[PDB]
Amino acid sequence: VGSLNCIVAVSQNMGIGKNGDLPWPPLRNEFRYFQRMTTTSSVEGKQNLVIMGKKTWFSIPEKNRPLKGRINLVLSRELKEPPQGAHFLSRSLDDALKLTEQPELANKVDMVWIVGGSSVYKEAMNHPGHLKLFVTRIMQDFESDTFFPEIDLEKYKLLPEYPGVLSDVQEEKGIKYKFEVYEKND
Ligand SMILES: NC(=O)C1=CN([C@@H]2O[C@H](COP(=O)(O)OP(=O)(O)OC[C@H]3O[C@@H](n4cnc5c(N)ncnc54)[C@H](OP(=O)(O)O)[C@@H]3O)[C@@H](O)[C@H]2O)C=CC1
Ligand SMILES: Nc1nc2sc3cccc(CNc4ccc5c(c4)CN([C@@H](CCC(=O)O)C(=O)O)C5=O)c3c2c(=O)[nH]1
Q: Write the CATH number for 156.
A: 3.40.430.10
Name the nearest CA neighbour of 40 among 129, 128, 164. Answer: 164
Encode 142-177: b = buried (16+ Cβ within 10 Å), e = exposed. bebebbbbebeeeebeeeeeeeeeeeeebeeeebeb
Provide the number of structural domains found in the chain. 1
What's the distance, CA 44 to chain centroid? 22
How many CA atoms lie within 13 Å of 181's alpha carbon, on the beta-carbon side?
A: 15
- Positive or negative torsion for Cα 46, 125, 53, 116: negative
How many CA atoms lie within 13 Å of 172's alpha carbon, on the beta-carbon side?
A: 13
Residues 53 and 37 sit within 8 Å (Cβ to Cβ): no
Residue 177 belongs to domain spanning: 1-186
Residues 148 and 10 sit within 8 Å (Cβ to Cβ): yes
DSSP summary character for residue 40 = -
Q: What angle is formed at CA 128 by the lines to CA 20 and CA 116, rounded to 5 degrees?
A: 10
**How far apart (Å, rounded) are the C-alpha atoms in residues 3 and 109?**
10
Name the nearest CA neighbour of 170 among 18, 33, 13. Answer: 33
- Positive or negative torsion for Cα 62, 67, 68, 74: negative
Q: What are phi and psi of 120, to 5 degrees?
A: -75, -40
How was it solved?
A: X-ray
89 is annotated as an active-site residue: no
Rounded to 10 degrees, the C-alpha dihedral 90/95/101/105 comes to: 0
For residue 183, count other CB atoms closer than 10 A to its CB.
16
**How far apart (Å, rounded) are the C-alpha atoms in residues 16 and 10?**
5
Name the nearest CA neighbour of 173 among 148, 139, 149, 128. Answer: 139
Phi-psi region of 40 (alpha: psi -120 to 50; beta: other; left: phi over 0): beta
Q: What angle is formed at CA 160 by the lines to CA 135 and CA 149, rounded to 5 degrees?
A: 25
Name the nearest CA neighbour of 74 among 63, 128, 58, 64. Answer: 58
**How far apart (Å, rounded) are the C-alpha atoms in residues 138 and 72?**
26
Residue to mutate, 7, 57, 64, 70, ligand 2, most ligand atoms under 8 Å from C-beta: 64
Q: What are phi and psi of 124, to 5 degrees?
A: -60, -40
Residues lining ligand 2, CB < 6 A? 7-9, 22, 30-32, 34-35, 56, 59-61, 64, 67-68, 115-116, 136
**How far apart (Å, rounded) are the C-alpha atoms in residues 139 and 146?**
17
Residues 159 and 133 sit within 8 Å (Cβ to Cβ): no
Which of the following is catalytic: 4, 30, 75, 89?
30
For residue 2, count other CB atoms closer than 10 A to its CB.
15
At how many Å resolution was this determined? Answer: 1.4
What's the distance, CA 148 to chain centroid? 11
Omega of the bond leading into 66 within 30 degrees of 0 (cis): yes
Give CA separation, 124 vs 71, 87, 115, 116, 175, in Å. 19, 21, 11, 10, 29
